[PDB]
Amino acid sequence: MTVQLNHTIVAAHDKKASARFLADILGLEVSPQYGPFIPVEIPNGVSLDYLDSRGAITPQHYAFLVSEDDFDTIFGRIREAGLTYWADPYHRRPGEINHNDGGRGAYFEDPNGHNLEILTRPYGSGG
Amino acid sequence: MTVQLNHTIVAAHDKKASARFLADILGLEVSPQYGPFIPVEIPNGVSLDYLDSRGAITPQHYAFLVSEDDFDTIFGRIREAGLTYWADPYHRRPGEINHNDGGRGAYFEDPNGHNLEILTRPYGSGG
Numbered sequence: 001m002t003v004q005l006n007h008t009i010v011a012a013h014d015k016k017a018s019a020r021f022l023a024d025i026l027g028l029e030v031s032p033q034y035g036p037f038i039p040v041e042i043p044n045g046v047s048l049d050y051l052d053s054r055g056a057i058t059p060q061h062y063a064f065l066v067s068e069d070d071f072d073t074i075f076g077r078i079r080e081a082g083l084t085y086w087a088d089p090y091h092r093r094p095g096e097i098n099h100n101d102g103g104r105g106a107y108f109e110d111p112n113g114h115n116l117e118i119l120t121r122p123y124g125s126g127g
Numbered sequence: 128m129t130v131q132l133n134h135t136i137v138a139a140h141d142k143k144a145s146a147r148f149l150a151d152i153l154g155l156e157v158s159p160q161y162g163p164f165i166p167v168e169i170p171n172g173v174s175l176d177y178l179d180s181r182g183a184i185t186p187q188h189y190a191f192l193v194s195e196d197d198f199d200t201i202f203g204r205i206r207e208a209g210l211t212y213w214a215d216p217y218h219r220r221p222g223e224i225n226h227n228d229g230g231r232g233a234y235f236e237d238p239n240g241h242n243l244e245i246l247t248r249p250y251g252s253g254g
């Protein structure tokens with residue numbers, strides 16, 4: 001079944017600032033507002049649709065598989081933003097990257113506390 | 128940038144039952160457990176990784192673009208499960224489908240309250 005994940009909603013205090021944060025960090029573009037959402041289209045057919053939140057925002061986890069050249073570019077923008085990054089999902093190792101599955105990866109936070117991850121090889125792969 | 132959304136985490140009371148629920152309803156398969164996660168691979172390169180939750184589960188929204196033939200099949204399974212479905216995201220119209228953008232769509236809930244949506248044409252399209 002040619003099923004695709006088409007979108008998920010990302011709760012945000014400032015949906016426009018939060019969508020721009022993700023779009024800028026990943027080298028993508030923000031879409032025009034659609035209803036109450038600010039969508040960010042990810043190239044594999046799914047959009048992260050930012051919605052103004054009320055009350056506490058439960059942190060979600062969004063992990064992006066990126067090319068090695070994109071890893072270097074994204075990593076540059078993270079450092080330029082003065083953001084702490086971590087090798088590990090539990091944030092024990094700030095200022096380091098992991099090398100899972102022969103790739104490279106790191107975790108960081110968006111303005112709402114969502115846990116963003118970049119990785120260059122799929123979990124459990126290596127070739 | 129060939130960036131892909133690779134995975135997100137889905138909080139669940141019973142990660143195995145919840146992953147099986149989604150896999151069965153969409154006609155997909157559940158992957159072997161990886162760490163604490165039960166992944167469900169969606170064909171466009173993203174997995175929904177089910178994780179045992181503690182405390183309240185904040186409902187998330189996962190929308191799947193499906194073929195028209197898959198819509199009929201999935202809709203059949205929803206009815207066979209005795210699940211209420213709704214035309215609208217606010218759940219005002221039970222037992223009806225929407226026809227957004229010349230397609231067909233409906234909303235329903237997973238065992239944790241996550242808001243699942245199926246649609247056959249992308250939001251804002253029609254051709």
Ligand SMILES: [Fe+2]
Pocket residue numbers: 061063117134
């Ligand atoms: Fe991850």
Ligand SMILES: [Fe+2]
Pocket residue numbers: 007188190244
């Ligand atoms: Fe939706």
